[PDB]
Amino acid sequence: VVGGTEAQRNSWPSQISLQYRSGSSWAHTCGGTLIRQNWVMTAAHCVDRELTFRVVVGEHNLNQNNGTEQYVGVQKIVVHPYWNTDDVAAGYDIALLRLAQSVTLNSYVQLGVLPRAGTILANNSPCYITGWGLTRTNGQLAQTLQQAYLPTVDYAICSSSSYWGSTVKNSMVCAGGDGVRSGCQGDSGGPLHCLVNGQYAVHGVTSFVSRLGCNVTRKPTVFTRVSAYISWINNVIASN
Numbered sequence: 001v002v003g004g005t006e007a008q009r010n011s012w013p014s015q016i017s018l019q020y021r022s023g024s025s026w027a028h029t030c031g032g033t034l035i036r037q038n039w040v041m042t043a044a045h046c047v048d049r050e051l052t053f054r055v056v057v058g059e060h061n062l063n064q065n066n067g068t069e070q071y072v073g074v075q076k077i078v079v080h081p082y083w084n085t086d087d088v089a090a091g092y093d094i095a096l097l098r099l100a101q102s103v104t105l106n107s108y109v110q111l112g113v114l115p116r117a118g119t120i121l122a123n124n125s126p127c128y129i130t131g132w133g134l135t136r137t138n139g140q141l142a143q144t145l146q147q148a149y150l151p152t153v154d155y156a157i158c159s160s161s162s163y164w165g166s167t168v169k170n171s172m173v174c175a176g177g178d179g180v181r182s183g184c185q186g187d188s189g190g191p192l193h194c195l196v197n198g199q200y201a202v203h204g205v206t207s208f209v210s211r212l213g214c215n216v217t218r219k220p221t222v223f224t225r226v227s228a229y230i231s232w233i234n235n236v237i238a239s240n
């Protein structure tokens with residue numbers, strides 16, 4: 001997150017950290033959202049490489065013990081059948097991870113709420129991005145969970161020539177674009193939480209930014225539109 005502010009510890013209890021076994025250590029690579037006790041939602045591109053992954057829930061500081069973490073192995077990865085690595089702008093940036101164990105829910109560990117299928121947010125809807133990715137372009141990871149106020153930009157505006165043009169599809173959500181705040185490398189997979197009917201719901205799964213840099217004016221962060229997948233999400237879990 002470029003332009004963010006440290007989150008309060010208790011604030012976004014469905015946020016996970018997706019990591020891979022790096023040497024003797026475990027390196028953070030993405031965000032996710034905990035959608036069942038034993039399922040996490042993330043971007044397929046997080047899982048292009050065949051690594052060893054684990055999920056951390058109740059996470060706040062990457063580098064210290066918070067007293068709240070649970071660390072689960074990733075037993076099974078289901079990427080959208082149509083996802084194509086060479087073509088992020090085709091969409092389908094979404095994957096589900098079935099966890100080796102069910103995590104225990106508490107004050108720090110809750111399920112994230114998904115939107116009803118088909119829901120589309122009005123322009124300039126009040127959303128937040130969270131995650132531990134780069135705090136500048138070509139910067140470095142946040143140690144603590146960062147949140148940025150990231151108001152949506154509707155399709156019509158987003159696909160206009162002076163924003164993304166054609167590269168954005170109606171299966172995506174755009175948010176921010178102000179040149180100050182954004183997601184960055186290390187935020188992919190993560191939530192875009194928006195306030196619908198006084199619940200935060202997870203509408204976005206961070207996908208991509210500009211090749212030019214993370215916080216580029218009139219290139220908002222682009223997220224997989226969750227409400228476009230609901231029936232796919234439910235079919236996976238019902239079937240695995």
Ligand SMILES: *B(O)[C@@H](NC(=O)[C@H](C)NC(=O)OCc1ccccc1)[C@@H](C)CC
Nearest residue numbers: 045088089183184185187188207208209
């Ligand atoms: B998440 O790990 C990461 N996302 C990506 O690297 C995606 C897959 N690609 C990307 O941002 O490519 C740049 C591009 C290419 C083609 C059209 C438009 C943009 C981070 C960067 C997301 C916060």
Ligand SMILES: [Ca+2]
Nearest residue numbers: 061064065066
């Ligand atoms: Ca910690």
